[PDB]
Amino acid sequence: RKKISIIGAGFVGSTTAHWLAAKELGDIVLLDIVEGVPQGKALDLYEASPIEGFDVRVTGTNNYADTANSDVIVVTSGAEDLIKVNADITRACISQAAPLSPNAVIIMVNNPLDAMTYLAAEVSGFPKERVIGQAGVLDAARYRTFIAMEAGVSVKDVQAMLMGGHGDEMVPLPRFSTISGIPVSEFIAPDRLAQIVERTRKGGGEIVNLLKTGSAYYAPAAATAQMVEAVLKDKKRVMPVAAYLTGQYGLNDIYFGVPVILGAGGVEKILELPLNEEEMALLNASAKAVRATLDTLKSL
Amino acid sequence: MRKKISIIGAGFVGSTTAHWLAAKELGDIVLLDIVEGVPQGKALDLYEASPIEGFDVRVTGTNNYADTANSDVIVVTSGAPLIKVNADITRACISQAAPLSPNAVIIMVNNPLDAMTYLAAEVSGFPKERVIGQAGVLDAARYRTFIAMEAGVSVKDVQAMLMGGHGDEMVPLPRFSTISGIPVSEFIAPDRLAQIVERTRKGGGEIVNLLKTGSAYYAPAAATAQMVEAVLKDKKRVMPVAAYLTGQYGLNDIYFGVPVILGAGGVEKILELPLNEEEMALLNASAKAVRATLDTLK
Amino acid sequence: RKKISIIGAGFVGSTTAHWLAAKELGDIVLLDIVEGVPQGKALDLYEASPIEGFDVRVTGTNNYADTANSDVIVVTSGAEDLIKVNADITRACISQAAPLSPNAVIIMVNNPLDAMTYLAAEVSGFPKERVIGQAGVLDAARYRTFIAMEAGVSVKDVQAMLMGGHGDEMVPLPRFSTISGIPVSEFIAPDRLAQIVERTRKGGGEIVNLLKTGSAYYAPAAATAQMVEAVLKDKKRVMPVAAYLTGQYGLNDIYFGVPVILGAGGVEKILELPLNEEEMALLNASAKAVRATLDTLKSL
Amino acid sequence: MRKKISIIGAGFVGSTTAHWLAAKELGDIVLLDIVEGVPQGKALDLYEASPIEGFDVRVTGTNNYADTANSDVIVVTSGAPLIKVNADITRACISQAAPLSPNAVIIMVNNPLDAMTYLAAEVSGFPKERVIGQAGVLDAARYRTFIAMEAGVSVKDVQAMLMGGHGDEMVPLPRFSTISGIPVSEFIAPDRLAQIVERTRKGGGEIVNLLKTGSAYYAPAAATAQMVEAVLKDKKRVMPVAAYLTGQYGLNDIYFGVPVILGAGGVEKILELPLNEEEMALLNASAKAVRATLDTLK
Ligand SMILES: NC(=O)c1ccc[n+]([C@@H]2O[C@H](COP(=O)([O-])OP(=O)(O)OC[C@H]3O[C@@H](n4cnc5c(N)ncnc54)[C@H](O)[C@@H]3O)[C@@H](O)[C@H]2O)c1
Ligand SMILES: NC(=O)c1ccc[n+]([C@@H]2O[C@H](COP(=O)([O-])OP(=O)(O)OC[C@H]3O[C@@H](n4cnc5c(N)ncnc54)[C@H](O)[C@@H]3O)[C@@H](O)[C@H]2O)c1
Ligand SMILES: NC(=O)c1ccc[n+]([C@@H]2O[C@H](COP(=O)([O-])OP(=O)(O)OC[C@H]3O[C@@H](n4cnc5c(N)ncnc54)[C@H](O)[C@@H]3O)[C@@H](O)[C@H]2O)c1
Ligand SMILES: NC(=O)c1ccc[n+]([C@@H]2O[C@H](COP(=O)([O-])OP(=O)(O)OC[C@H]3O[C@@H](n4cnc5c(N)ncnc54)[C@H](O)[C@@H]3O)[C@@H](O)[C@H]2O)c1
Ligand SMILES: [Cl-]
Ligand SMILES: [Cl-]
Ligand SMILES: [Cl-]
Ligand SMILES: [Cl-]
Ligand code: NA
Ligand code: NA
Ligand code: NA
Ligand code: NA
């Protein structure tokens, strides 16, 4: 069977195992540095299988050797201090897991997302197409959710593309969002759409402020699981993913959220959308912020 | 209790619709037909597949309209794969089924689609929003399939809207189709897209020419079942369906394929697209043809 | 649409919302006394809907008025002191939610399960068939999981019935467990089967010891969600549920885990299995322990 | 890449099997038939239903065996709904398909089932564990359906094992059927159970008598698709299937319906039930009949 290793069995990691288990895509290995945590969550989820009817081997471990020969490696072990702390963790996870699964596609979740994905590429030495980051699917999901709510339509009929990174680094593109092929601008007035775009930018913080302790995990995990499925089933999904750029949108040597075709080979194509002056202004300012974070990381 | 769906006409499309619905576990299914044994056999066969698929659906076959009473949704797939023959079949089906399920949403499938839906509305006397026809979901599905195949992307990421009726009456709208929010024109060039539009127009005939002895049913049934689901779960799906127009697109007193929000109340909203002059030219010509068929019906 | 209210948006409650949301059974209301917690988890899960493709209205609240007219009420707000603390919480939740949803089926999860279900029946005044407790489905799930693992077969082909309550109160019945209709005893030797039965009894504690902080939730939530689905779809599931007895197995005026047919009417039938001398010895000792807990509760 | 499933014979059972499998999103599906247009039409029709159902499955139709190369699973549903006609059809199908997919697990559906599976084993020369036949899953499904209907419980909670072949060759085993681990005898009395056993024996004929012009396909296809899934996902399902026996139940050199653990390796284990003398009497008589058909084949 296919093999998926999730490094970091916290809220996002365990929830990702939950979403994946129900899909019955393959074996799942939950790894963490804390003893008992992954073993307990994995066994708990495994014991729910007879009820849900899925046949999935879900195991927990503290030994990287158990992640060997994985088809996909999901990294959810993350916690300038933020960059340093996460850089050290990401470094540790990738330097230990990558060598054991040379043919795997690595999907980063740790924040700062774009920067941590860049670091994972460096440490793993994997072809850039096989090291990607999850950020855009979650952000587009919030946007799509708000649009469906406001427009009064099924979430299954709303599509949307966006780029960049989190919050201020986010590059919203309402022009590239539709409901059953019809522009979203036809359903929602400019003023309200602007509010929705703003709510999207602050989407992660909105959850953090409500939970008081901890950040979002159901949607982030769902986003991550969808990307894992895309690779495993070679589905050719068109989605915004953190990818390594070599000229697209005028950006070079940097991980940035862009539209891609995701399949068995990881990033199989980076789409280059013809953005107008206003949208490019947004992307340039975003790339500036992402670049700044990337530089801070390189100076560590 | 559970929701109740009655499928009138247990042929290829009707039986296949029962198959798609059963797997969805949306509620009881009653397959009715004028031919004895046929609906009973297909219904029992499908029911016997339930322990394998793990779904709890009571699917039964019958020749008695009394068994369709109090249905939440009535699907009509009894037509013969022309206006006269189907007009009589449709009137007979609706006249017997409608009175027994006064709160049901009727989904017409019989061809000529737009015209038969109009007839069902007349005979049933049901509020217009609760009498609709399936046509556009199937045609948009063929279009989306071709786009997905050509672009090399998941069908889950392709969406499209179109209007009108079948074949020459279809009103393609490539401008209103996207892949994850991105215009299809970004993936497929003009000439190739035009070929896909043409293949979509001839989509039904393409399957007919291949099967030789009948018409399509897997996709037509899937489309029909998706509309049934939209109603039963009040999903508010945005899809092209045959609806009664009262001024939209400049059309009155006519059933025509238009974008709608489909839910428990049936057509809960008819969307008004900002069609350009080229697209409007196609729509007007289509309406003229649909109008012609309607006149012949009256 | 159907309406499900989950009282107590903690690990079990939020996870139950997750399992239910994917089933697309109806609207879900997550309620908690803590501000922000339910609103955050509900919104997080709602934002995952466009990714998973399900249309489910998931909302969080601190106002019981938002649970009015629910089809099913799930209680997962629980924390002699244990009985008292949980008795007070259960009392508060039921006395406030029951009056607002007079036609709902109440499914208790709070521990001590059997006793808390009994209390919910008293406080709600609902017909006993409409007040049940989840315990047996989870326990049978662990048992079935261990059997599938050992026998080397799909979890979809293992069935098992058991009675009583948790741990020492559990009444295992290997004789009433099969794989595609074949007795489990045909696949697993007596010594090993005994170990599996023992592992089942300690199943909850095994997870607690691994997690160190907190108890199981994936399987408990799955068990709860399966019971909710049984009521909403009037599925007539045959499962062990905490029900009110009036003579079955020689027990009267007590909630105890027994085999039932679960549907729209809640408990539609309490099956009376012909247990042998050995099994009855187990059930009597269990009923003694459950009774003791029930008495402690009545003396509060 | 994806898994590849080839279905030889695009008739009712074959096309319906493609339908069940497509919804499962297990891998590519190739529908092959000797009749031109038929497989192509059904495959394209089903493919066009994918954007509606939201599944990514490449389903294609063909008349060329070359398109079935390197399949993980080969389903054979080409037989005519007797030994001679199907023996020739089966030999032709296996002789052409087997060499192109040397690592595939062959699942026979053609009747006479046990005999045709034996023939497929001979012609393919494949390890016996990788050549099996579908028969028991369907019969057990009918039985489980009747039990569920009679007991008033979910089909998800009913499980049962049976052996042998079709109709008079079937070896019912009510003793080995339960509802959530509880013996069926606890819910249904002896006489009623006997009636259900008889209805199960005649289950196939019951559908035939109703349809009038053909045999069952929804449940037969579901059963076949479930076996395909078991192999592709190495699910280790415990089910009755036609397997090659080397001493089990005292039977040698014969294909017979027996309980097995079905996975990626095909039959990964043949279970040996502790049958009493009554049940063994039924099995011996059944084996005698299956043996008779086998002799006629040789
Ligand atoms: N990209 C997105 O869209 C997105 C969305 C949400 C959260 N995130 C990020 O994902 C990360 C995880 O969030 P969370 O809420 O699940 O956190 P968490 O604290 O619940 O879980 C992280 C887990 O990682 C484990 N861990 C730490 N160091 C490790 C190491 N070296 N190896 C293996 N395991 C290790 C911890 O012990 C812990 O169980 C954070 O960086 C967070 O900011 C990203
Ligand atoms: N709108 C679309 O997108 C679309 C797509 C495909 C087919 N169709 C149309 O759907 C209809 C059915 O196609 P089919 O391939 O399933 O046909 P079919 O001939 O296989 O089945 C029709 C069934 O209707 C039954 N029937 C006839 N009169 C009846 C009556 N008065 N009451 C009850 N049952 C009656 C027949 O006995 C038959 O079993 C045709 O009109 C066809 O053109 C529409
Ligand atoms: N029956 C079983 O098989 C089973 C299995 C596991 C856990 N449980 C039990 O389920 C309960 C919940 O476990 P958990 O891990 O989810 O706990 P938890 O502490 O994570 O969550 C309980 C939630 O209830 C809320 N709460 C407290 N008082 C409340 C009130 N009056 N009204 C509304 N909300 C209130 C809390 O604020 C908290 O968010 C416990 O009693 C536990 O022992 C039962
Ligand atoms: N084992 C079971 O439980 C079970 C249940 C039902 C039916 N069956 C059997 O399955 C078979 C198919 O039943 P059906 O109803 O689908 O029949 P059908 O007649 O509808 O379809 C058979 C298809 O096989 C094709 N075919 C014939 N020779 C071929 C060859 N050499 N190569 C490729 N394709 C060829 C035909 O052209 C036809 O489309 C029959 O033998 C039937 O008795 C078995
Ligand atoms: Cl960054
Ligand atoms: Cl028309
Ligand atoms: Cl108790
Ligand atoms: Cl035979
Ligand atoms: Na999926
Ligand atoms: Na068919
Ligand atoms: Na079908
Ligand atoms: Na279910």
Describe the structure.
- Chain A has 300 residues and is an alpha/beta fold.
- Chain A folds into 2 domains: 1-135, Rossmann fold; 136-296, Lactate dehydrogenase/glycoside hydrolase, family 4, C-terminal (L-2-Hydroxyisocaproate Dehydrogenase, Chain A, domain 2).
- Helices cover 44% and strands 21% of the residues of chain A.
- Chain A has 10 helices and 14 strands.
- Chain A has a 6-stranded parallel β-sheet, with helices on both faces.
- In chain A, a hairpin with a 2-residue loop joins strand 10 and strand 11 (182-183).
- In chain A, helix 1 packs across helix 9 (218-232), helix 4 (81-97) runs parallel beside helix 5 and helix 6 crosses helix 9.
- Chain A starts with a strand and ends with a helix.
- Chains in contact: A-B, A-C, A-D, B-C, B-D, C-D.
- Chain B binds chain C through residues 1-2, 25, 54, 56, 233-236, and chain C through 1, 24, 55, 156, 233-236, 264.
- The complex binds nicotinamide-adenine-dinucleotide (4 copies), chloride ion (CL) (4 copies) and sodium ion (4 copies).
- One nicotinamide-adenine-dinucleotide (NAD) binds at residues 7-13, 31-34, 37, 76-78, 86, 89, 92-93, 109-111, 113, 134-135, 138, 214-217, 220 of chain A.
- It is classed as oxidoreductase.
- The entry lists the keywords oxidoreductase, tricarboxylic acid cycle, malate dehydrogenase.
- It forms a tetrameric assembly.
- Large improvement in the thermal stability of a tetrameric malate dehydrogenase by single point mutations at the dimer-dimer interface.
- Chains A, B, C, D are malate dehydrogenase.
- Organism of A, B, C, D: Chloroflexus aurantiacus.
